[PDB]
């Protein structure tokens, strides 16, 4: 990283994968899942969808480095389940920061 920050910690979402097996599969592991998303302040860039797509990729990467360095390596399906959780939180943090963009 460098230049990034970490936003407010929020509720680890129950994504519905449409199989309650998968919902609960993440849900058992959800203690280890990320609790907050890495983000950046409102410089110039903002964007909706592509900024989330970056915030996702960063937070998953920083899992896949900083947590995987700990001998805790993910698999593709676990990464995708994280991507969803991180996306869900990040949609929210963006929307929240956009309320203070209006306050400027």
Please say whether the beta carbons of 7 and 34 come within 8 A.
no
Residue 16's CATH number: 1.10.790.10
Helix (H) or strand (E) run with residue 6 in it:
strand 5-6
Q: For 39, phi and psi rounded to 5 degrees?
A: -145, 180
Of the CA atoms within 13 Å of residue 75, those in its CB half-sphere come to 2
- Could you give the residue ranges of the DSSP H alpha helices within the chain? 20-29, 49-62, 76-103
Instruction: Map tokens 């990729």 to a residue.
Output: 57
- Tell me which residue range forms the domain holding 86: 1-104
Instruction: Map tokens 């990034």 to a residue.
Output: 4
Q: How many domains, in total, are found in the chain?
A: 1
- Kindly report each contact of residues 11-20 with a partner whose C-beta sits within 8 Å and lies 24 or more positions away, as own/partner: 12/85, 13/84, 13/85, 13/88, 13/89, 15/81, 15/84, 15/85, 15/88, 17/81
The SS3 assignment for 44 reads coil
Helix (H) or strand (E) run with residue 72 in it:
none
N residues, the chain: 104
């Amino acid at each position: 990283l460098g230049g990034y920050m970490l936003g407010s910690a929020m509720s680890r979402p129950i994504i519905h994968f449409g199989s309650d097996y998968e919902d609960r599969y993440y849900r058992e592991n959800m203690h280890r899942y990320p609790n907050q998303v890495y983000y950046r302040p409102m410089d110039e860039y903002s964007n909706q969808n592509n900024f989330v797509h970056d915030c996702v990729n960063i937070t998953i990467k920083q899992h896949t480095v900083t947590t995987t360095t700990k001998g805790e390596n993910f698999t593709e399906t676990d990464v995708k389940m994280m991507e969803r959780v991180v996306e869900q939180m990040c949609i929210t943090q963006y929307e929240r920061e956009s309320q203070a963009y209006y306050q400027r």
